[PDB]
Amino acid sequence: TYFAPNSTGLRIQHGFETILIQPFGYDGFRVRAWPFRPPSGNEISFIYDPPIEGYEDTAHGMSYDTATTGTEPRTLRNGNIILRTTGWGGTTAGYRLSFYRVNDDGSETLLTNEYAPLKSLNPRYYYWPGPGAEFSAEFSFSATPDEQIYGTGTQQDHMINKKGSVIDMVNFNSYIPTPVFMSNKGYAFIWNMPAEGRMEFGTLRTRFTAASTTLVDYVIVAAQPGDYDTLQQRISALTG
Amino acid sequence: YFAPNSTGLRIQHGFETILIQPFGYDGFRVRAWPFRPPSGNEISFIYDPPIEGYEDTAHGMSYDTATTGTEPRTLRNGNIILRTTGWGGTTAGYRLSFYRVNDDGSETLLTNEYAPLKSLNPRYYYWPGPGAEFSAEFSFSATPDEQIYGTGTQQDHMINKKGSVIDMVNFNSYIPTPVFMSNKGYAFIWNMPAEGRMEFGTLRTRFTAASTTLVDYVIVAAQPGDYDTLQQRISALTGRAPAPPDFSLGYIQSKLRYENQTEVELLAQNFHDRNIPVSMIVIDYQSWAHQGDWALDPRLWPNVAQMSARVKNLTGAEMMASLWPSVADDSVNYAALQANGLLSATRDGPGTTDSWNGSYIRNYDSTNPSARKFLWSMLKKNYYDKGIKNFWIDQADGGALGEAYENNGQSTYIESIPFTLPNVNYAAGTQLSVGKLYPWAHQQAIEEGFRNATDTKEGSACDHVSLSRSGYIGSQRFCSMIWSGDTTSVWDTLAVQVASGLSAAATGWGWWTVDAGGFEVDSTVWWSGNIDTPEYRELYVRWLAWTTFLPFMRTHGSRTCYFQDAYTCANEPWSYGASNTPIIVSYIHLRYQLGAYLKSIFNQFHLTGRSIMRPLYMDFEKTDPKISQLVSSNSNYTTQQYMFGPRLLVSPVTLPNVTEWPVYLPQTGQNNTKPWTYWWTNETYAGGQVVKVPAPLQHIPVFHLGSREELLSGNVF
Amino acid sequence: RAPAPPDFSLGYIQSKLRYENQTEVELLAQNFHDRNIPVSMIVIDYQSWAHQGDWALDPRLWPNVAQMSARVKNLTGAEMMASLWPSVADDSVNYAALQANGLLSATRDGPGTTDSWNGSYIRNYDSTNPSARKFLWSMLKKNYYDKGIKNFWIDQADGGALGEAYENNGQSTYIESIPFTLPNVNYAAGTQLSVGKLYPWAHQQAIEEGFRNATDTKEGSACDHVSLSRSGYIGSQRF
Ligand SMILES: *[C@@H]1O[C@H](CO)[C@@H](O[C@@H]2O[C@H](CO)[C@@H](O[C@@H]3O[C@H](CO[C@H]4O[C@H](CO[C@H]5O[C@H](CO)[C@@H](O)[C@H](O)[C@@H]5O[C@H]5O[C@H](CO)[C@@H](O)[C@H](O)[C@@H]5O)[C@@H](O)[C@H](O[C@H]5O[C@H](CO)[C@@H](O)[C@H](O)[C@@H]5O)[C@@H]4O)[C@@H](O)[C@H](O[C@H]4O[C@H](CO)[C@@H](O)[C@H](O)[C@@H]4O[C@H]4O[C@H](CO)[C@@H](O)[C@H](O)[C@@H]4O[C@H]4O[C@H](CO)[C@@H](O)[C@H](O)[C@@H]4O)[C@@H]3O)[C@H](O)[C@H]2NC(C)=O)[C@H](O)[C@H]1NC(C)=O
Ligand SMILES: *[C@@H]1O[C@H](CO)[C@@H](O[C@@H]2O[C@H](CO)[C@@H](O[C@@H]3O[C@H](CO[C@H]4O[C@H](CO[C@H]5O[C@H](CO)[C@@H](O)[C@H](O)[C@@H]5O[C@H]5O[C@H](CO)[C@@H](O)[C@H](O)[C@@H]5O)[C@@H](O)[C@H](O[C@H]5O[C@H](CO)[C@@H](O)[C@H](O)[C@@H]5O)[C@@H]4O)[C@@H](O)[C@H](O[C@H]4O[C@H](CO)[C@@H](O)[C@H](O)[C@@H]4O[C@H]4O[C@H](CO)[C@@H](O)[C@H](O)[C@@H]4O[C@H]4O[C@H](CO)[C@@H](O)[C@H](O)[C@@H]4O)[C@@H]3O)[C@H](O)[C@H]2NC(C)=O)[C@H](O)[C@H]1NC(C)=O
Ligand SMILES: *[C@@H]1O[C@H](CO)[C@@H](O[C@@H]2O[C@H](CO)[C@@H](O[C@@H]3O[C@H](CO[C@H]4O[C@H](CO[C@H]5O[C@H](CO)[C@@H](O)[C@H](O)[C@@H]5O)[C@@H](O)[C@H](O[C@H]5O[C@H](CO)[C@@H](O)[C@H](O)[C@@H]5O)[C@@H]4O)[C@@H](O)[C@H](O[C@H]4O[C@H](CO)[C@@H](O)[C@H](O)[C@@H]4O[C@H]4O[C@H](CO)[C@@H](O)[C@H](O)[C@@H]4O[C@H]4O[C@H](CO)[C@@H](O)[C@H](O)[C@@H]4O)[C@@H]3O)[C@H](O)[C@H]2NC(C)=O)[C@H](O)[C@H]1NC(C)=O
Ligand SMILES: *[C@@H]1O[C@H](CO)[C@@H](O[C@@H]2O[C@H](CO)[C@@H](O[C@@H]3O[C@H](CO[C@H]4O[C@H](CO[C@H]5O[C@H](CO)[C@@H](O)[C@H](O)[C@@H]5O)[C@@H](O)[C@H](O[C@H]5O[C@H](CO)[C@@H](O)[C@H](O)[C@@H]5O)[C@@H]4O)[C@@H](O)[C@H](O[C@H]4O[C@H](CO)[C@@H](O)[C@H](O)[C@@H]4O[C@H]4O[C@H](CO)[C@@H](O)[C@H](O)[C@@H]4O)[C@@H]3O)[C@H](O)[C@H]2NC(C)=O)[C@H](O)[C@H]1NC(C)=O
Ligand SMILES: OC[C@H]1O[C@@H](O[C@H]2[C@@H](OC[C@H]3O[C@@H](O[C@H]4[C@H](O)[C@@H](O)[C@H](O)O[C@@H]4CO)[C@H](O)[C@@H](O)[C@@H]3O[C@@H]3O[C@H](CO)[C@@H](O)[C@H](O)[C@H]3O)OC[C@@H](O)[C@@H]2O)[C@H](O)[C@@H](O)[C@H]1O
Ligand SMILES: OC[C@H]1O[C@@H](O[C@H]2[C@@H](OC[C@H]3O[C@@H](O[C@H]4[C@H](O)[C@@H](O)[C@H](O)O[C@@H]4CO)[C@H](O)[C@@H](O)[C@@H]3O[C@@H]3O[C@H](CO)[C@@H](O)[C@H](O)[C@H]3O)OC[C@@H](O)[C@@H]2O)[C@H](O)[C@@H](O)[C@H]1O
Ligand SMILES: *[C@@H]1O[C@H](CO)[C@@H](O)[C@H](O)[C@H]1NC(C)=O
Ligand SMILES: *[C@@H]1O[C@H](CO)[C@@H](O)[C@H](O)[C@H]1NC(C)=O
Ligand SMILES: *[C@@H]1O[C@H](CO)[C@@H](O)[C@H](O)[C@H]1NC(C)=O
Ligand SMILES: *[C@@H]1O[C@H](CO)[C@@H](O)[C@H](O)[C@H]1NC(C)=O
Ligand SMILES: *[C@@H]1O[C@H](CO)[C@@H](O)[C@H](O)[C@H]1NC(C)=O
Ligand SMILES: *[C@@H]1O[C@H](CO)[C@@H](O)[C@H](O)[C@H]1NC(C)=O
Ligand SMILES: *[C@@H]1O[C@H](CO)[C@@H](O)[C@H](O)[C@H]1NC(C)=O
């Protein structure tokens, strides 16, 4: 009785950047974005395709069902997670991402969306520091002051709630920063990137950065609140 | 005063040099650089010597002791002491730590360099280019209970910035400025013009610079709860504000936009015939022929000296005009600006920095002194010498043309395409290395022109003012007021503006204001900005009432309407319904009735940096024990209430259809009395409780300490 | 290995800057016919469009171009060639579509403009983007090829800036002489520094693909039509 998806993925052409959102595993979406040049195909990934456990029969790859330029809003549902493409500001469009969970009582809860209030930097920011095509990436997502962040690897901070902390993604003795975290809102998030960077768990914005990359890749999975054993069931099905 | 026994300490720690000097009262200045010494032409926003301090002359690079940091040392100036230490269990002197000597003799650690056993270097250097310029990341320790106030302006609805990351990139309504106070009893200034990052994490505070040749910061200590001294030290370091001209304290009429000369003359005729006082009429943008002409289009403003004189004859009001920093090819000044190198430019390609009005443009170089003087020669010829002697320096955030997206003026879809923000070339550096200076130097362009025409020195009494949307460290030194930028005309926006102005106060900015009623229409709220609907008419009257108790009372916005009889929808005190006209005019009269109180509190800000609009921790943290937590949680009682001067307590109504409003009256320190008097009922209440007062549409919840006749006299200090 | 050229291209090619409207072109063919002077191809130069990026003759001066090409072939038997620039301006009817589908190159920071011309700052279309090559042929085949103008003059497609070794083209020689750095723009195949030499080669390829698609012919076989290019690279003789 699983709410299987009706689309293999959505590919948005937003100017020079392409965003490929695909249903991935149970109650999960996989988002990939790149400016100008398509993925080489030799990028390093830490997630399984298809997931170790999920609704799928075969791997997704780059497959998608619908292509748009993001002029109009769209909606895609997989399991209990729903994606809603929207505009920025008062506009009605479909180049901004937002993720909801369908609760047991029929209502919906906003897990997170791309941090794009009226006056703010682009939630998918690209910057070219070198003469080549490799770029640095800064992706921003909304957050609430009451949110709680669990995981993010190991660190001697004497805290299990990582909210309000910045975690640099550079390894050294006793410090293994890993961008895999659970939120008490009922969702988990995987920044599937091997590049060094930064984890910002701010009061109103969650931001991940990549020092140098050719492709941004993350996965978001939803679960009913308080049910952390399912979140870990989904994370392990994605990463091992 | 505990004067220091050393002029400074210079540490040679490998290839990096650290120069720590006593600076002002209870302050230390720290400068560090790897390999190459400072050129001496770095951009600095602090005074040497401070405007007020123990010193007789400037410090410069002078120091008393030189060491390699092999052994620990101690240096004391005032109540702050520096202790150089090792890292880990080591005994050395290459790590910095700062303590305050309390009144009871004991000491409290303000902060040290974040260096636990396993951690990155608290002074991290990185070379991204082939040259010697470097990126810097400086880390300081922090505690989970700490509270951060200031950091500039932002629409975050918080006065406690703990747990937030603040990017140092300017855009509309967002002026990140690395000057903050901590509730531990110290202030900190990251004296750097480079773009970067502010990390106020749970256990680590980090500042970064994208490209620089020198790191420079100042730390100053004060006894806990005593924020008035922190602001006294900050203003002595970065600038003591001048006294504003008396006319600027009145009612400022503005909108988007008064389009031709005869429309402005009928506006003054309306204020005169209706016997409604007005102190300044503002002319908005798009009033020029081309971007960069810096003059009113004669086809719509044929005789502006006659216009300003007629406006002054009917209302006595002064005039203000708008200018943008962008110049297009169709400008009469484009060839001259291009030839003399007075324009910024992207570092490859044609050099255009953004777009507007269907043309791609280039911002003038405010860091170039020749460009600043070229621009005043236009403003003085076409405005100042023609009766318009106040200037609206709009859309000068720096880099792009005022927004966080490129291709301004085009479709919102194109604006949303993530074109990278430009790292432009300036005369003083690049956008990444010196970008934060651009709006600060733009204010300076008008300040230099003002002081030159009046033959007065900076810091003295102003004859005229400028209206700016951005700034930086020490922007309070100019005859210039900052406003919160483009806001939406909805109820939630009105509640968020308060915390932005309170954060500006903690940054050192006193001359702050908003757009009464908001600026932009919210397309998802059908009544937003509609001056003919009762829904927005209610919102505007609540908003206009609040601006009465702000450093500057000004109305402005881009309204919508059902009936239009001009170029744009109206925004005048008689444009919101017949029943609302007497309400708006009453607050206009009340504003002029507070003139003595306004000039008195603006003067103390000029002498001491005495904050004008005051967050509740500055006056009642020592007193009310409940306030420490109400600020930590960013309660509406602390993000939406404030002290306007030493006597008034203000709390705007931020909800529709409301007749009672809950105001938290803080404790004042006399438990057997009732010090709070409600303005509209004259009823007295005791401190330390939340009260629900009658708040009809015409009344804004305002309490006052002492007698009303004394605060109206100005004698409050 | 180069293809064999069409026989008509080996004759006399008449061109200048510039034949401005349709009636001037028709009187030119009438002159060759009345004087019995042979001509094999008539060329229409640039600035014959309404906006940069429209990729069509301005109807205010070329009202019926299918009739113009047919009249030219009736009087002289000559084929026709028209000019197109790779620049796109905001006033273009194709600007919104080119921007939304990512068919324009761009400088890597700032608004993205790559040069200037005709008093407007412009962006070059991305010849390395296969989708952009298709977009441009859909314009040329609609407004030229299917209307008797089946040879194309792909001018000012050197890559990076707009055809010159200086930025701010079309402006004063003093401004042009100011050493604004040549742009390291973003392409779909790389940057100007990493793949820039491909731009004019891929621009020739755009029309070669269009020519071979219309005639159902393989590249390298006999050509029915030609293109006039000012730049190229390794192996450009294959077109
Ligand atoms: C004291 O201090 C406190 C702070 O410390 C302060 O609290 C702050 O208060 C304000 C106002 O009270 C709060 O602001 C609101 O926040 C809401 C939540 O925002 C987030 O989530 C939404 C998505 O929300 C959808 O789904 C959830 C869950 O399912 C629902 O609960 C929601 O209702 C909403 O549902 C709709 O849309 C769904 C999807 O399409 C549908 O499925 C569903 O059916 C519904 O139709 C995100 O969109 C937000 O993202 C935005 O902001 C983030 C981060 O900034 C950005 O990253 C992102 O890009 C976006 O910009 C966000 O994540 C908002 O929903 C709410 O929005 C309303 O008002 C604002 C104006 O302020 C409008 O601009 C906005 O359009 C919304 O207006 C509509 O609804 C209002 C009233 O509800 C109507 O009046 C209005 O007409 C309009 O109607 C629209 O929808 C109607 C629905 O039927 C429809 O009828 C109409 O036709 C019309 O279309 C607002 O922003 C803020 O969060 C508080 N902050 C905190 C920390 O608590 C407090 O106020 C202070 N108190 C006092 C007295 O001062
Ligand atoms: C439940 O959870 C709770 C939280 O989740 C948890 O709380 C945590 O508990 C731990 C353990 O208690 C706390 O850790 C301590 O933190 C202290 C404060 O550290 C900060 O400040 C110091 C500098 O402070 C000085 O000045 C202040 C005020 O003036 C004094 O109060 C201090 O005592 C101290 O004074 C000395 O030095 C002064 C000047 O030099 C002198 O004037 C004075 O006379 C004193 O000699 C900073 O140095 C610290 O910085 C370090 O960490 C930051 C950030 O990580 C880095 O940036 C920086 O580089 C440094 O690494 C910090 O900012 C520490 O002082 C305290 O340290 C002692 O123990 C640790 C081992 O844990 C030793 O490694 C360390 O050397 C210290 O040891 C000395 O003193 C101890 C006992 O006090 C002796 O046992 C020991 O022998 C040693 O002796 C030395 O000094 C003696 C002084 O008399 C002397 O007699 C000896 O001869 C010898 O010289 C420790 O790290 C932690 O903060 C809590 N965390 C939080 C969030 O609260 C709680 O435990 C949990 N509960 C349970 C049941 O689990
Ligand atoms: C950037 O680039 C862009 C383009 O990429 C540049 O834009 C271009 O600039 C060029 C020149 O710089 C322009 O060429 C001129 O165009 C005008 C306009 O022509 C049009 O509009 C005419 C009238 O329109 C009005 O009425 C119509 C009625 O329907 C109405 O719809 C409309 O709203 C408006 O109110 C039309 O009549 C005319 O059409 C005619 O001719 C067509 C050609 O074949 C034909 O198709 C039509 O059937 C119709 O017959 C057309 O649509 C032209 O007028 C102008 O031509 C004059 O000047 C040129 C020299 O530049 C000269 O060679 C011509 O002979 C002509 O000269 C007459 O008047 C002169 C007075 O100035 C006079 O001196 C001449 O002698 C001549 O007149 C008389 O005697 C002679 C012989 O004795 C006789 O032949 C005449 O009939 C007459 O009796 C140019 O072609 C482009 O149009 C323009 N393109 C665009 C899109 O704007 C831009 O400048 C650049 N920008 C920058 C910053 O660099
Ligand atoms: C980018 O930005 C630029 C600017 O930064 C934008 O440009 C501007 O756009 C605005 C509006 O979009 C324009 O304002 C409009 O200007 C016109 C033109 O006005 C001038 O010329 C008039 C006619 O001139 C002729 O005769 C003279 C002889 O001297 C010749 O030289 C000319 O060549 C012409 O042949 C002239 O009559 C006007 O003068 C009058 O008013 C002035 C000022 O009060 C007096 O000094 C004069 O004495 C004289 O009375 C003027 O010089 C105006 O006509 C427009 O007004 C109308 O429309 C308004 C709303 O748009 C409305 O509020 C007005 O009431 C008025 O309405 C008219 O129509 C109504 C109903 O249809 C009638 O009821 C009413 O009677 C009247 O008929 C308006 O003010 C700017 O001019 C223009 N600026 C520039 C430099 O071009 C540009 O649009 C932007 N572009 C992009 C892509 O974003
Ligand atoms: O940007 C070009 C693009 O704008 C489209 O507007 C969208 C945009 O609106 C912002 C704009 O609002 C004006 O006011 C309008 C309001 O938009 C209408 O809803 C209302 O009915 O009428 C009022 C008055 O005409 C303000 O006057 C503008 O200042 C404001 O634009 C900002 O302007 C500043 C500089 O002044 C600039 O820096 C900013 O970049 C710019 O946003 O955003 C909100 C969307 O809902 C609007 O659709 C427009 O529709 C379109 O045609 C095109 O012109
Ligand atoms: O470049 C703009 C700038 O030109 C100034 O002209 C200078 C320039 O001339 C080059 C230009 O020549 C045209 O032919 C002119 C000729 O130059 C004149 O001497 C003659 O009297 O008139 C003819 C035609 O009217 C060509 O038609 C143009 O192609 C050529 O311009 C170059 O154009 C190509 C594209 O066509 C472009 O890619 C180049 O960037 C551009 O340079 O250089 C020689 C100087 O002696 C001239 O003074 C002009 O004065 C000025 O107003 C401005 O328009
Ligand atoms: C200066 O004073 C500090 C403490 O105030 C002391 O540790 C140091 O030895 C003194 N140095 C000199 C030269 O007096
Ligand atoms: C002041 O206004 C009155 C209005 O009648 C006018 O008579 C008088 O000349 C004006 N003075 C000036 C300097 O314009
Ligand atoms: C102000 O600048 C002017 C230049 O127009 C100069 O002549 C004058 O001396 C300056 N005023 C001073 C130095 O007081
Ligand atoms: C000037 O403004 C008045 C008042 O709004 C208006 O009636 C008139 O049409 C305007 N004139 C022009 C040319 O815009
Ligand atoms: C409140 O007192 C003031 C003077 O202190 C007076 O002007 C006002 O009318 C009083 N309002 C009342 C009694 O409602
Ligand atoms: C071309 O058509 C014309 C009629 O418009 C006719 O007189 C002439 O014979 C034709 N010539 C050729 C070569 O078809
Ligand atoms: C050429 O491309 C078109 C689409 O543009 C396609 O329909 C056709 O099959 C291709 N081949 C030929 C010979 O037309």
Side-chain angles (χ1 to χ4, degrees), chain B residues 642-660:
Chain B
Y642 63 96
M643 287 285 142
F644 187 61
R647 306 279 172 106
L648 292 177
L649 171 82
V650 185
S651 176
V653 171
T654 67
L655 290 178
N657 295 93
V658 156
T659 45
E660 285 216 321

Side-chain angles (χ1 to χ4, degrees), chain B residues 557-570:
Chain B
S558 186
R559 308 286 181 254
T560 178
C561 58
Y562 291 149
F563 166 76
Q564 203 176 319
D565 56 354
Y567 185 73
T568 55
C569 294

Side-chain angles (χ1 to χ4, degrees), chain B residues 2 4-6 64-65 73-77:
Chain B
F2 200 112
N5 66 338
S6 178
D64 230 329
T65 310
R73 313 186 146 260
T74 302
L75 217 172
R76 176 172 180 177
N77 171 30

Side-chain angles (χ1 to χ4, degrees), chain B residues 134-137 168 190 192 194-197 207-212 432:
Chain B
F134 58 93
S135 91
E137 293 172 315
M168 287 194 268
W190 181 255
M192 305 280 281
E195 292 192 345
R197 193 198 319 152
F207 298 87
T208 69
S211 175
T212 184
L432 289 193

Side-chain angles (χ1 to χ4, degrees), chain A residues 157-159, chain B residues 81 83 85-89 95-97 99-100 102 106-109 111-117 119 139-144 184 203:
Chain A
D157 57 356
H158 210 157
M159 311 171 71
Chain B
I81 82 178
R83 285 199 176 99
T85 53
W87 146 70
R95 290 278 166 263
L96 309 187
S97 62
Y99 300 81
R100 158 166 51 71
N102 310 312
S106 64
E107 295 175 0
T108 53
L109 171 70
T111 179
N112 52 21
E113 307 189 310
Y114 184 77
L117 190 63
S119 68
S139 301
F140 309 90
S141 64
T143 50
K184 281 193 180 163
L203 300 177

Side-chain angles (χ1 to χ4, degrees), chain B residues 464-487:
Chain B
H464 315 280
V465 307
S466 72
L467 179 58
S468 167
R469 211 180 64 190
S470 192
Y472 202 52
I473 303 170
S475 281
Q476 68 273 3
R477 74 184 68 179
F478 305 116
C479 301
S480 184
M481 63 179 85
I482 302 170
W483 97 96
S484 59
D486 292 354
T487 42

